Amino acid sequence: MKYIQTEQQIEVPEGVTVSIKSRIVKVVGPRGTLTKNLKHIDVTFTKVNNQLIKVAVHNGGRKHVAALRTVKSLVDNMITGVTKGYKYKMRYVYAHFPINVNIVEKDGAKFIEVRNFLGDKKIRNVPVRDGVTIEFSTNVKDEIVLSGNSVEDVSQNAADLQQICRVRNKDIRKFLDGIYVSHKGFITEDL
């Protein structure tokens, strides 16, 4: 309804620096550096006191101001990703056939190899996007852990593992086999 001025607040902690070009956001923190292209959103960034960013939309519609709040979420996800990181915990679900998941190398590409899913002789391969760390954690049975700075990369690669292990030609309510994200949090505990 053409809000004159709609505003959102981006809180910047002490140890991170945010360098913002026209719509190129570069967040540099203790854990790494993230970059995002926002030239499709037509918003305005302005720094207030070197730990606070204001992003505003002027004379924006319902959809325009709705995506303004999305920009705040995207930037805060960048900032929290270089301070605390992201870790997504996935458990293996199988009734009869244990799912053999490990790390395999082909031309130095860091593929996640999946074997024996529902007894299939097909070998599923999930590429690891750059920035995502893969570790199998002991003392938790059938656990793969994906860690990284950007939630977009961490979550999507976890989703790729989940989607590659979808059951076909069966009642999915009974054949519940797959790899599902059991936890979504940060690398740093209780931060």
Binding site: R91, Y92, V93, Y94, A95, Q162, D171, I172, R173, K174, L176, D177, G178, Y180, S182
Partner: protein
């Protein structure tokens, strides 16, 4: 057989879903309108039928 917790986890994605009455689309369990354009985002949804 599956552990109860892992079966609950798998059900959260495979069974704990809604279904559109008009296009059979699989929707989130708390959705009020279907995301599909073919049905015109109709509000006629049902819970996904539980096994047995």
């Amino acid at each position: 057989i599956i552990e109860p917790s892992l079966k609950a986890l798998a059900s959260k994605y495979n069974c704990d879903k809604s279904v559109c009455r008009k296009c059979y689309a699989r929707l989130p369990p708390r959705a009020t309108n279907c995301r599909k354009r073919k049905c015109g985002h109709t509000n006629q949804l049902r819970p996904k039928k539980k096994l047995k």
